[PDB]
């Protein structure tokens, strides 16, 4: 079976590609090498096995259509995207072209030239908006949603906030609708935070890795900022848990096609920024000092209620936050 | 004030444009003349007064950008769109380009070059999906929604169905988010069925108007036997063009208070009709028999769509004044006039 | 056989379309109705026969590709374009998108899905630049090219001047290259001035028609004093629509022998006119005095443009039959009739 | 002064960028890293100085416009392009979007927001067509243009052959017209073959480099093909002369704005593929074995630039001999 990974030299993509390579799956990677680290990732993958690398711009309809027609993949992980909320605010046009435009270029090519292709799309918890319709409590280290003790499920109201939220949300709904109307085999994952090796976090994207870099410099002598008070919460999912989800879901596509699933590390793996700092301090014997910025354009809490996916395919995260965090630290140091 | 109406030669657009002309508001109309009857409306508006007509394609960024910088409108009703669900299924790329691409072209131009421009966007009831999460009952002439007897409000779950639903839904969310993020003055109306003069209905767009045309044909002994998709018990509240005009202008006048919000708009439960009920109204008014054949029900369809308008009425205290009976009679008269 | 005419509701297109209708050739007209008068031409054509009218934007790849796949025409006259040099200077982007992008949209659709389609493209004399490399003399009524007494042939050096010249020249070259590389059956006509019925001239396009309009007004006691750019001695050979119809259809009938070539097309030296000469003809025909004011010469201009048509006459034996004096009188009459 | 180089990680771009860094010029590099070796060139340049690297797609109007408004360069070398004729035949759509669309994206941004920007465009000899209107002569090793012993000048008829010729040609004419119509400071170079370090030749583009490679591959024990008989000729211009040409032309922009110039190694630096093969064989003590394919599309039998116009304008002239540059190219290639 042929597997195509758009954005294959990115964090998620490179991790998935490596599994594909280890499983002997014929792999096609499509990326523009725009993310700092993508080139390194590509070099690393090449050291793992042989595959087809196709440089291309997801925004370009011709590039995308030729990719599909030429390789006719059996399955595809559509990860090429504009990933930062901050950049979407400064460059909404690019964000729209990449996330909405790129997704539609892929959907149209698939529909017209390769309709049986199984597609998994990485959406976001931002399609849910600010989540201010619920009530929260504030403790010493974090906020808590009184109404949704175990996280939010797919029945949560859609309300796209920020251009990134609107472009991913539009792509999300089109993915789901192409399954209904045109019979495409699509699957949508509304993802909460992810972290792991091959992630080249930045100030604008990859909060967990970013703060690890923070803890790393501190360690080698190099205040930083935090948006808001640090008590905002996100469930954190390690790359190892993401790989299993992708491949397992792909293998069960016939059963789950046409649905969206909330994906995250779950309540047990929930962390506030403050809580994340503790952990790092405690591992590296350090002190993370910072200044405050106003709250971002932001969910006080985001925890996925994964009953849906668990029930469908029996997947659950095996990597705990503490564990994954130390490993993330180790990897960051490694750079 | 200068008012820009994109899709200004269409059904809603020309009605709104006529009002602007009568009230001395300076008008700019932008349209590509693609809708059959658009040329007729343009001609009709031209005889009503003077205004700036700008032929253009909303999908074209340069056309849109130049329009905004050149005229710098104070307000704008963004009505240009791909309006047929059917067409959206047959040509999803076109639907996406016009509805999403075109809306973003306008948003970007206003954001960058004329940020104070007020914008009202004509969205749809299709952003709510099939609404099968609710409970229904089937009566003799219609389907009734048991737990939402007065229609649906803005708290209904968004679930874009059909490419038309997806394109209008994406544009809808972008309009709301631009108010939030970039401070634009936008308003979104999620509309249910509208009908009235200047509407040149077709098989796949303007159900009330199309069925009125079927009646006119029958009345004149024209054999062009028709169909309905489903059993005809599906319901929609219908809103007359006169009420649509008052809503747009009233809303505009209160934009400062309503900016950044979406409102479900419709004729309300009292003006709702199933196709079977519409047929009866026509048979009574015209002294005819509406014979038809049933086709399978539509791919994407809502058994019932009635807007609960508490939100808009509470904000601007606008409410529909034209009854379904009265409006449909008027509509038949207009149709027969063509 | 099906014939597709892009730009089918314009001046050339409507004339060509009408002939197809009369000869019973299956016709598809593709147009966006952007040129004023396009709707009138469309209505007019509608009164001559039946055909498929497809509203669309040549700049839009999807509209163009669908058009080809859906109708699979056997021949096509590609006339949709941005025709004004002034507009090309004020909006080079649009000019480029229409003329280069639109032509490429068509070329690619044909190449991939209907490679046998014969295509005739209407290029321009502007691909030859200012022509200042030749020598000229000036008389009391016009300029004359002393080294090119029979006009310019296809051997003249290409030098695109103006964005219009650049967009049309790029399309022209692509048309010819697609015949070479991809084996398409293309023919390019580098046209000099054309005029005739169904042409709704404006200040910016259709100089002959424009000045005829000026004469009608004066005739009719109307005052809209006008201008000319430069001294009025600049010359153009003028070709009447009647000759143009025969050209296109005769050429189409001989495509196999002429595919992959460019031909200079015009009324020829015998039909060359300067603006001053044109005024004189009109004053005589109408018994009026044509007063005007002179403006600076247009930046991008040819003092003389006359087509040396030996190549096309040798290939298909077509030659213009309508003289300038006779054509202009006819044009005046058409103009007055409007 | 700020210099923006589009296609800055490519062969010409990296060479020009290194020089700029050496002169202490504020540099902006724009590239999508599509060419194989681009990432390598980006890494190589990185240690030469500080500069701004902007990843972007020239096809994308938004990327290009933001680039111009954000950096407001004083000068620009527009090298981002679809460089292969072959590939243009296989993907004319892409060739058109990159060469024509990309160039108009740049010209529009400059026209509207940074109109004094000086721009040098790298066009091609392919805008001249097949050149069959001339008379040739075959010798044992090459073809000769009987009517143009010193090469072709700017007065040669324009006739764009191949989609690449059409796309580059349209962009070339637009560059010149924006100068006349909009007062832009543009210069067009109709370039014949260039080669040197930092060039990552492929089957499709970079003939001298490609064959050097061919040379390397063999010597290292381990067939290749040639399109036509190998007697076709090109003048070859080394990277060193290209660098001087660019910077000198840029410095003299006020006097050459709005013009096109044919650029090449000149006749003394002309080579046929067969002659190049000797070069290597000797220089390498080897035998270059190949199979023949049909002649490339519209391929010119002879392309030698008559540089009188440019020499008269800025007195630039190539100083690197083919023998010399080719040997060094060989050396450089073997070193990779
Ligand atoms: N990592 C997370 O925590 C998280 C949270 C939710 C959603 N997602 C989604 O998962 C997907 C992958 O995320 P990631 O963390 O690996 O990000 P990433 O930036 O590391 O990977 C994306 C890859 O896409 C490539 N790319 C970007 N623009 C492109 C374009 N125009 N054409 C082609 N390729 C292009 C980039 O070079 C990069 O290698 C994205 O859609 C992201 O929005 C990730
Ligand atoms: N009338 C209803 O019952 C109803 C229901 C809900 C939503 N709407 C929305 O209200 C708006 C107006 O609807 P309407 O009934 O007046 O439709 P309409 O078709 O009569 O009006 C749309 C107008 O836009 C023009 N247009 C279409 N594509 C264009 C393009 N690419 N560029 C420029 N102009 C273009 C058309 O020529 C036409 O004049 C649309 O956005 C529609 O989705 C209408
Ligand atoms: N009339 C002349 O003297 C003359 C001289 C040289 C070349 N030409 C060329 O001949 C062709 C016909 O010119 P004409 O005089 O009939 O002009 P015209 O304007 O009357 O006809 C062109 C038609 O194309 C349509 N059109 C324009 N933009 C379009 C778009 N984006 N999508 C679809 N349709 C579009 C217009 O609505 C118009 O009906 C043009 O390519 C023109 O440049 C004409
Ligand atoms: N090398 C020659 O012999 C020669 C001869 C004539 C003309 N030229 C022209 O000179 C220029 C540079 O040639 P070169 O040999 O250095 O080629 P090159 O391939 O090494 O350089 C072009 C660069 O542009 C980048 N690029 C390609 N497509 C892009 C896009 N869509 N957006 C952004 N960047 C993109 C590539 O990644 C590459 O780094 C080109 O315009 C070429 O056609 C070169
Ligand atoms: N440099 C940074 C990065 C992220 N953050 C915060 O980190 C939190 C989690 O990042 P996010 O919301 O973008 O992550 P996801 O929920 O998409 O995984 C947010 O409140 C960000 O504002 C921060 O304060 N400083
Ligand atoms: N020719 C037609 C048009 C509409 N209809 C139906 O009439 C109902 C209302 O039409 P619609 O859903 O397109 O109307 P709106 O909600 O957009 O106003 C739908 O169930 C259509 O399928 C029909 O049966 N026959
Ligand atoms: N209103 C007008 C229109 C054209 N003209 C001039 O008429 C001459 C012919 O117009 P043109 O060059 O656009 O015509 P073509 O050769 O493309 O048919 C040019 O010199 C125009 O500048 C004018 O002086 N006034
Ligand atoms: N792999 C190759 C590459 C080029 N060539 C020939 O080399 C000559 C020079 O190639 P070219 O004109 O496209 O120049 P460059 O852009 O590669 O510098 C042409 O006649 C090519 O067909 C060849 O025979 N085999």
């Amino acid at each position: 079976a042929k597997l195509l990974i758009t954005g294959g030299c990115g964090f998620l993509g490179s991790n998935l590609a490596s599994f594909a390579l280890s499983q002997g799956i014929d792999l096609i990677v499509f990326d523009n090498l725009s993310r700092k680290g993508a080139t390194d990732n590509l070099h690393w993958l090449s050291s793992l096995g042989n595959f087809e690398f196709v440089h291309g711009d997801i925004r370009n309809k011709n590039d995308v259509t030729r990719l599909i027609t030429k390789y006719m993949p059996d399955s595809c992980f559509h990860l090429a995207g504009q990933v930062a909320m901050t950049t979407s605010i400064d460059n909404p046009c690019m964000d729209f072209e990449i996330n909405v435009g790129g997704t539609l270029n892929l959907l149209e090519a698939v529909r017209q030239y390769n309709s049986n292709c199984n597609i998994i799309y990485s959406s976001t918890n931002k399609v849910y908006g600010d989540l201010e319709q619920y009530k929260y409590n504030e403790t010493e280290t974090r906020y808590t949603c009184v109404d949704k003790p175990n996280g939010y499920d797919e029945s949560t109201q859609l309300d796209f906030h920020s251009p990134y939220g609107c472009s991913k949300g539009a792509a999300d709904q089109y993915m789901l609708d192409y399954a209904r109307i045109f019979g495409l085999n699509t699957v949508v994952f509304r993802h909460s935070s992810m972290y792991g090796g091959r992630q080249f976090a930045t100030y604008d994207q990859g909060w967990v890795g970013w703060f690890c870099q923070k803890a790393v410099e501190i360690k080698n002598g190099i205040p930083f900022t935090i948006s808001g008070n640090g008590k905002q919460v996100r469930d954190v999912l390690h790359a190892e848990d993401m790989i299993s989800l992708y491949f397992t879901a792909l293998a069960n596509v016939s059963k789950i096609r046409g649905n969206a699933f909330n994906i995250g590390g779950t309540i047990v793996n929930s962390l506030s920024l403050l809580e994340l700092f503790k952990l790092l301090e405690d591992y590296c014997n350090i002190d993370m000092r910072f200044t405050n910025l106003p709250v971002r354009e932001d969910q006080r809490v985001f925890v996925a209620d994964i009953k849906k996916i668990t029930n469908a395919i029996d997947w659950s995260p095996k990597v705990s936050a503490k564990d994954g965090v130390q490993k993330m630290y180790d990897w960051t140091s490694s750079i």
Side-chain angles (χ1 to χ4, degrees), chain A:
Chain A
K2 294 170 269 178
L3 171 70
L4 162 63
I5 306 181
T6 70
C9 301
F11 160 52
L12 250 67
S14 71
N15 273 287
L16 296 166
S18 75
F19 184 82
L21 284 181
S22 77
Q23 289 304 279
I25 287 145
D26 292 349
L27 173 79
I28 301 113
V29 170
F30 177 87
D31 198 288
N32 65 355
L33 305 181
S34 56
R35 170 74 163 175
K36 233 165 294 196
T39 312
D40 300 300
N41 275 344
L42 172 61
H43 296 160
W44 170 66
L45 293 172
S46 298
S47 82
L48 306 174
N50 305 284
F51 59 99
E52 261 305 313
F53 169 63
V54 179
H55 184 284
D57 185 358
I58 201 82
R59 300 174 286 186
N60 192 269
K61 187 165 181 68
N62 188 50
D63 280 8
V64 176
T65 305
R66 296 179 47 110
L67 169 75
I68 296 299
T69 59
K70 174 175 190 139
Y71 297 94
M72 295 291 287
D74 292 293
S75 295
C76 168
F77 289 158
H78 180 44
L79 308 173
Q82 192 296 113
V83 317
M85 172 209 291
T86 54
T87 306
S88 81
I89 289 167
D90 183 61
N91 191 354
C93 173
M94 173 177 72
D95 175 79
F96 171 78
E97 303 168 338
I98 295 171
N99 295 329
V100 195
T103 295
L104 269 287
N105 287 341
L106 177 65
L107 288 172
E108 277 293 283
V110 166
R111 182 181 65 84
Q112 306 184 95
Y113 307 112
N114 190 28
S115 60
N116 279 334
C117 194
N118 299 312
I119 309 158
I120 301 193
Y121 180 62
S122 52
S123 183
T124 37
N125 64 111
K126 317 281 168 221
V127 299
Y128 296 117
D130 71 4
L131 291 166
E132 301 305 353
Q133 65 265 217
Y134 302 109
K135 75 190 189 216
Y136 304 77
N137 285 352
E138 172 173 352
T139 77
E140 268 312 276
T141 40
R142 66 160 54 198
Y143 285 117
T144 288
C145 186
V146 198
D147 293 310
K148 308 271 190 159
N150 302 324
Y152 307 86
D153 70 15
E154 306 80 5
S155 65
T156 305
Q157 179 69 73
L158 292 186
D159 175 5
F160 313 160
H161 287 220
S162 74
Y164 170 79
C166 288
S167 65
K168 293 294 270 197
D172 176 314
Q173 297 293 287
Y174 262 114
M175 278 273 168
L176 297 171
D177 204 59
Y178 266 55
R180 268 174 227 128
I181 305 286
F182 300 115
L184 298 199
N185 299 320
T186 62
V187 179
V188 170
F189 288 156
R190 290 166 185 165
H191 291 293
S192 189
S193 334
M194 285 167 293
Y195 70 97
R198 322 306 324 190
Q199 181 168 229
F200 295 91
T202 63
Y203 169 83
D204 298 293
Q205 205 259 341
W207 78 277
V208 172
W210 170 247
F211 293 118
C212 281
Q213 292 161 25
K214 287 322 85 190
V216 162
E217 318 188 319
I218 283 192
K219 205 73 190 159
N220 319 312
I222 304 157
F224 57 75
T225 60
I226 80 165
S227 293
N229 63 11
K231 298 181 189 191
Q232 56 264 43
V233 174
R234 299 290 182 272
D235 41 359
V236 304
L237 185 74
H238 194 262
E240 298 152 6
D241 285 320
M242 170 282 297
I243 300 181
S244 78
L245 166 71
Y246 275 70
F247 285 92
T248 187
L250 178 66
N252 282 272
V253 65
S254 68
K255 184 173 181 180
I256 55 175
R257 66 169 294 286
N259 279 278
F261 298 90
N262 283 359
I263 299 303
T266 83
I267 196 82
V268 338
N269 296 309
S270 80
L271 278 192
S272 62
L273 267 69
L274 296 181
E275 305 172 345
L276 164 68
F277 293 168
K278 230 119 283 308
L279 228 88
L280 295 177
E281 290 174 323
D282 283 32
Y283 181 69
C284 358
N285 331 297
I286 66 171
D287 277 323
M288 310 178 75
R289 303 284 120 103
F290 54 81
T291 65
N292 309 233
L293 306 199
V295 189
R296 77 81 144 126
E297 271 171 37
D298 214 32
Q299 283 157 351
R300 275 200 272 173
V301 178
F302 200 88
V303 177
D305 174 354
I306 69 170
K307 275 168 189 198
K308 193 188 179 179
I309 188 68
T310 297
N311 292 347
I313 67 174
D314 198 55
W315 165 94
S316 56
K318 299 164 155 175
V319 180
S320 85
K322 171 126 109 186
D323 290 350
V325 168
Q326 318 202 127
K327 276 166 102 248
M328 192 46 184
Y329 180 84
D330 311 332
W331 185 72
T332 294
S333 215
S334 102
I335 284 162

